[PDB]
Amino acid sequence: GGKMEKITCVGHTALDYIFNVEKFPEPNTSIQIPSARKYYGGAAANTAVGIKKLGVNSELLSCVGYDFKNSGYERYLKNLDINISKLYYSEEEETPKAWIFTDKDNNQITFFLWGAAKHYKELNPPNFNTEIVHIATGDPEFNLKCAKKAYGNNLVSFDPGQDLPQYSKEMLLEIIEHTNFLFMNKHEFERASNLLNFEIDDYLERVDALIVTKGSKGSVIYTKDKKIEIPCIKAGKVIDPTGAGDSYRAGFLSAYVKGYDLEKCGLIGAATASFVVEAKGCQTNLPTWDKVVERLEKH
Amino acid sequence: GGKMEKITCVGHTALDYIFNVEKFPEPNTSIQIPSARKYYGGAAANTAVGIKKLGVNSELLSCVGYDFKNSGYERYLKNLDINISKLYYSEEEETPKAWIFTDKDNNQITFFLWGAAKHYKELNPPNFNTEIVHIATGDPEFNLKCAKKAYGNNLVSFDPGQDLPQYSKEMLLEIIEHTNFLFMNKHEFERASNLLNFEIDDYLERVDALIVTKGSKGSVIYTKDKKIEIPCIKAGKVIDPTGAGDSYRAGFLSAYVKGYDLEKCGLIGAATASFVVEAKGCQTNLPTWDKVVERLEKH
Ligand SMILES: [Mg+2]
Ligand SMILES: [Mg+2]
């Protein structure tokens, strides 16, 4: 049939570390970083936490490591009442991590430790009883299994994100054919469209809504019937843009479950993203529902 | 007076992590690393462990973090009978770490998390009762305090290493004036000599032995009386060159304490270095004394 008032987020739960260096080192040189704070991250977790903060029950499906057990992150999620019953805990691998070296002018070079994500290929998705299954970056093969199992039962939301290069023409077409809400940033949309030889109408033969996000230039929602332009919502002061995308999706999907029309979903996504960019870390300044509604009332 | 049959190593104790990536990422891209093994490291610790493996009692003076306590590294050092009574344990900071991203052609870009090394400026050196105080990379101000306190009591060994750029003409002259054995790699020697306007004889007015290491082209020992050429000792197969320098110093200083002439000290240093380069990690393939003597017997 169809399922309950909740959203499942599938994909990375990770610890993000931002290392403030002066200059990237040339061969046979040692530069340093004073300290490196850890932030709770991972696209799936970011989205799940944002959804929960907006008053919608979320559940998380990720592979975590031996250093997740009893650690800051686990207690943090338990304290937020996020259902983590579906987490796979690895005995051998550590939790996925992103080690981000950033310079003095603010140019970022990153890295992603796969770690316990190696386990996705050993696993198969459970049945989902949620209204929406949102598939964020993770293991593409497992993500396709999730889309193909959920589609026609749960609404499927998908954003290929930085995983996009790993999808062949054929595999991308397959997951999109099992997607209800397809989110892509503009660069990724152009790349996907060139790969698929798709125009907008080709996506809309397969999905219910295509949402192209353009950051500071807003977003656009395309359906069969309509093109909806969503403005960017002005933040107070941009400290960290990293969590913005996941937070827009968190807001959009939360609004959808809460029963608003797609335009309002877009506006809530935009308003949500405007909060997260005000602080460092993808989950640090996630807003409540009433705070997001209040900000849209001003803008 | 003078002191006992032991060597104090001052400076970094660190955890080294080598991350095997495909290509360094361009702006707004996510590449990955499958896993990242941890190796026991830090120039001071590397040297102390190498010394101990050669049958000479060593002690370590480093600032370590809250994640050192009870961790792999602490038990490992205790099990090797390395005196770690002088370690400073930080409550607030983590242990220094080196995060080394390496590519497919084998080009390395590195980073050094300062962490608990912030505490050196809060501390002052104890009296040392050892025959040699070896001062490796660390906090230059604390290192100078160590040299100035030890000189004329303990023999002082010093290598500015990758810290060399942090020393002004004046500060470098000062620590060298309190050094008995000065080690430098050739590039660092040329840089130091240009900065100081020193020729070899200028060093020798201040130090007892200047040891210039040239890796695969061997090393040279200069004293007032003599120039001693030390060949490189052929290894089996070079897997990791990272630990080679510290191991040469470990061998050289161990031989010195064991009462051999400087030429033999050089040869032992060379032979020791030939073992460490055969495996990944700076301490993983550290040889015993008899094994080092045996290898020189062949070469
Ligand atoms: Mg269809
Ligand atoms: Mg003098």
Curated annotation (Swiss-Prot), chains A, B:
Listed cofactors: Mg(2+); Mn(2+)
Binding site for substrate: 16, 32, 42, 46, 110-112, 162, 246
Active-site residues, as the UniProt record annotates them: 246 (proton acceptor)
Gene3D superfamilies in alphabetical order: 3.40.1190.20
Presence of the UniProt keyword Manganese in the record: yes
Residue numbers marked as site, Transition state stabilizer: 249
EC number(s) from the headed UniProt entry: 2.7.1.213, 2.7.1.73
Highest taxon of the lineage: Archaea
Cofactor info, note text: Can use Mg(2+) and Mn(2+) with equal efficiency in vitro, and to a lesser extent, Ni(2+).
InterPro entries in alphabetical order: Carboh/pur_kinase_PfkB_CS, PfkB_dom, Ribo/fructo_kinase, Ribokinase-like
Catalytic activity, as annotated: cytidine + ATP = CMP + ADP + H(+); guanosine + ATP = GMP + ADP + H(+); inosine + ATP = IMP + ADP + H(+)
Enzyme class: transferase
Alphabetized GO MF terms: ATP binding; cytidine kinase activity; guanosine kinase activity; inosine kinase activity; magnesium ion binding; nucleoside kinase activity
Family: Belongs to the carbohydrate kinase PfkB family.
Role according to the record: Catalyzes the phosphorylation of a wide range of nucleosides to yield nucleoside monophosphates. Shows the highest activity for inosine, guanosine and cytidine, but very poor kinase activity with adenosine, thymidine, uridine and xanthosine. ATP is the best phosphate donor, but can also use ITP and GTP. Shows extremely low activity with fructose-6-phosphate.
The protein's name in its UniProt record: Nucleoside kinase
Species this chain originates from: Methanocaldococcus jannaschii (strain ATCC 43067 / DSM 2661 / JAL-1 / JCM 10045 / NBRC 100440) (Methanococcus jannaschii)
